Amino acid sequence: APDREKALELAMAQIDKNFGKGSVMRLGEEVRQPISVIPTGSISLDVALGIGGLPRGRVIEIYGPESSGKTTVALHAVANAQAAGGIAAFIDAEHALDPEYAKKLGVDTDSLLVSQPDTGEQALEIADMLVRSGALDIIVIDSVAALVPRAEIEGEMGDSHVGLQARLMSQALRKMTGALNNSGTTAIFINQLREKIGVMFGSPETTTGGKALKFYASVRLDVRRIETLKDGTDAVGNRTRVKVVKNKVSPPFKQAEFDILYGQGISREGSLIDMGVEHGFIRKSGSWFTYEGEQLGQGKENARKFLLENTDVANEIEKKIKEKLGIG
Fold first, then answer.
1. Residue 228 · residue 238 · CB < 8 Å
2. Residue 67, annotated ligand binder?
3. Which of 24, 158, 237, 324 lies deepest, with the highest CB count within 10 Å?
4. Domains of the chain, earliest start first
5. Are 121 and 100 within 8 A, CB to CB?
6. Angstrom distance (rounded) from CA 242 to CA 156
7. Per the annotation, does 116 bind a ligand?
8. CA-atom Rg of the chain in angstroms
9. Are the C-beta atoms of residues 21 and 149 closer than 8 Å to each other?
């Protein structure tokens, strides 16, 4: 028993020692939690990541079908990074950002460094110089799929092979991790699953030229919409499910759910209630949500709305949910 786990612990040790820390883990471990991280905006996801936020100095990949909430997740990541006084950059190749929305999420759009690259290489090239200045904290590349090769934009092949794409990522992605691991800048790449009932186009590790992103990525998130919320009226948002299919900073395969309110973002309040009851602090006596004595109204909405106009207590619920589990 000890002799067995003794040689095993030795084994693991050396492996960690030669291939990096989280190279081998017991899905049950509780990792040696870091001091700096980037909250995602949902306590659920935050904890599901094991370190209370996204890791710094690592490349994070977020993929899922269109309209699944990838960017909303990434936007908060940006907003938070900012609140803590950090600088952000957004390399855009989709031309689909809506600032008013970001603003409503907490993004300081005015100080938001933005770029709309000409060619795919130019893109990653700019992201690199940017990260090397070591002044940025977070940088998100909107759409892995959009970063098309110069060659493709002017004369050569059609989807790769006769010219350049699945390598552009590789090349770039390799010289960039080192810069990141030093600068302490977390990078977010947004990938796509290209369809929703298809037949013949662009993939790799599931997706787009990012067969290299699959490995470099220290964390890979699988964002997908599960249900269409309705407040006794119409579409108010969607319940979003997220699976951490790859986590090198902590045991993987953890899942998280949280609703995104159309035009509002990742409902913190809601995330607090669900975790609030999923851990005891709150008690639902049939539509009646209560908290250690005092009530929080009837129905999840009123509870939410409550926690909204009651930050003081809400932070308490949050605090007590964090203290109970892992910090950051």
1. yes
2. yes
3. 237
4. 25-266 (3.40.50.300), 267-326 (3.30.250.10)
5. no
6. 38
7. no
8. 21
9. no
DSSP per-residue codes, 111-149: S-EEE--SSHHHHHHHHHHHHHTT-EEEEEEE-TTT---
* Exposed / middle / buried, residue 145 (Cβ in 10 Å: 0-12, 13-18, 19+): buried
Resolution of this PDB entry, in A? Answer: 3.2
Would the annotation count 70 as a binding residue? yes
287, 289, 290, 296 alpha-carbon torsion, rounded to 10°: -120
Method: X-ray
Q: Is 186 annotated as a binding residue?
A: no
Is 240 marked as binding a ligand? no
Query: What is the C-alpha to C-alpha distance for residues 328 and 51, in angstroms, rounded to an integer?
Result: 6
| Residue type for position 91 | I
Residues ≥6 apart with Cβ < 8 Å to 162: 156
- 69 is an annotated ligand-binding site residue: yes
Answer whether 304's CB lies under 8 Å from 270's CB. yes
